[PDB]
Structure formats: structure tokens, C-alpha cells
Design a protein around this ligand. Structure first.
Ligand SMILES: Cc1c(Cl)cc(S(=O)(=O)NNC(=O)c2ccccc2O)cc1Cl
Length: 167
């Protein structure tokens, strides 16, 4: 039993809801919140911009030190950093950005990072400003992630579309 509330059960381990991931994280304080990161951990917009704003820019400060030490992530890769006031940990995961021309096949590799964590609050990877079809992202999520994933979808119209088309 965990503290997530109001989710629709899509599969054995995947749950989906219309929610602002920032507000969901602040309320649930999950062990792991997933950020829709880029390879530079520059949290300017989209989900990353919103998560970073909620930490009063502390996520960005921590991230800049991480990059200065380690260099950029790989597309499809991840790193674990602090969750600040939102979660115990933040798993920064880089899905391919379609508005950059990156290979959508890397979306499966990106979701594989979720399997290192028993329970996660997460957005759909590569959705939104990353340019991929959120329906496809959901399919890859369900077919790749084996741990318990709670997907927060900000847009109510998109949430409704995501449920009604799910196979
Ligand atoms: C960067 C990013 C990611 Cl990676 C994931 C999500 S989401 O999982 O909340 N889905 N939402 C959408 O695709 C969307 C599309 C068109 C208009 C509004 C939308 O909200 C949002 C964002 Cl901005």
C-alpha cells in the first residue's frame, strides 16, 4: 500500500492520472519523482522547468555542479539527484527530443531507467515539448517498465485521450 490517490489502473503496475506533477509530488512526497531532463540538465521549460521552479532553483544549482563534475548525460540515460522539497530523490531521465531529431527508438532505453526503482511518480517521457506522440510514449512505458509507475498527465484533454485509446 502506498499514498497515491485517484489514479486509474492501466495495468498490473502502471497507473495514470490528470495531475500537475509538481502538486502531486508536493502532496505525496514520493521516494522518486522523474524529471523530463535534457542531457545538460538545463531545466528551462516543460516538466523540468516546472519541477525546478518549485525547488526555488535548487535543482538547477545541484544539476550544474553534477554536469561540471560528470559531463552531460546520454540520450536514453539518467542520473539520481536530490528530490529537494518534492521527493526523496529525483531521477533525471533523458528521453529523445523529436524537435532535435533524436531517434525515437531511444525512448525504450529511457524508460528502462525506471526499472531501477520500485515505485516512481513520472511524466510521459518525450511528450510535451520533446515532440513525441504521448500515446506512443504510454505504449512504450507499459511495454518496458516493470516496476510501479504512477503517471501524472498535466493536460486534462490529453489525459482523457490517453485513457480512451489505451489497448
Ligand atoms: C516536456 C513534457 C513532457 Cl516530457 C511530458 C508532459 S505530460 O506527460 O504531462 N503530457 N502532456 C502533453 O504531451 C501535452 C501536449 C500538448 C499540449 C499540452 C500537453 O500537456 C508534458 C511536457 Cl511539457
Amino acid at each position: 500500500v502506498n499514498s497515491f490517490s485517484g489514479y486509474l489502473k492501466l495495468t498490473d503496475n502502471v497507473y495514470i492520472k490528470n495531475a500537475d506533477i509538481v502538486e502531486e509530488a508536493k502532496k505525496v512526497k514520493p521516494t522518486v519523482v522523474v524529471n523530463a531532463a535534457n542531457v545538460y540538465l538545463k531545466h528551462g521549460g516543460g516538466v523540468a522547468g516546472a519541477l525546478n521552479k518549485a525547488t526555488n532553483n535548487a535543482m538547477q544549482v545541484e544539476s550544474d555542479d553534477y554536469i561540471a563534475t560528470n559531463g552531460p548525460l546520454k540520450v536514453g540515460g539518467s542520473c539520481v539527484l536530490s528530490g529537494h522539497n518534492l521527493a526523496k530523490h529525483c531521477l533525471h531521465v533523458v528521453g529523445p527530443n523529436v524537435n532535435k531529431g533524436e531517434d525515437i527508438q531511444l525512448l525504450k532505453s529511457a524508460y528502462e531507467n525506471f526499472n531501477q526503482h520500485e515505485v516512481l511518480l513520472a511524466p510521459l517521457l518525450s511528450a510535451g515539448i520533446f515532440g513525441a506522440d504521448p500515446i506512443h510514449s504510454l505504449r512504450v512505458c507499459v511495454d518496458t517498465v516493470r516496476t510501479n509507475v504512477y503517471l501524472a498527465v498535466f493536460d486534462k484533454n490529453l489525459y482523457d485521450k490517453l485513457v480512451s485509446s489505451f489497448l
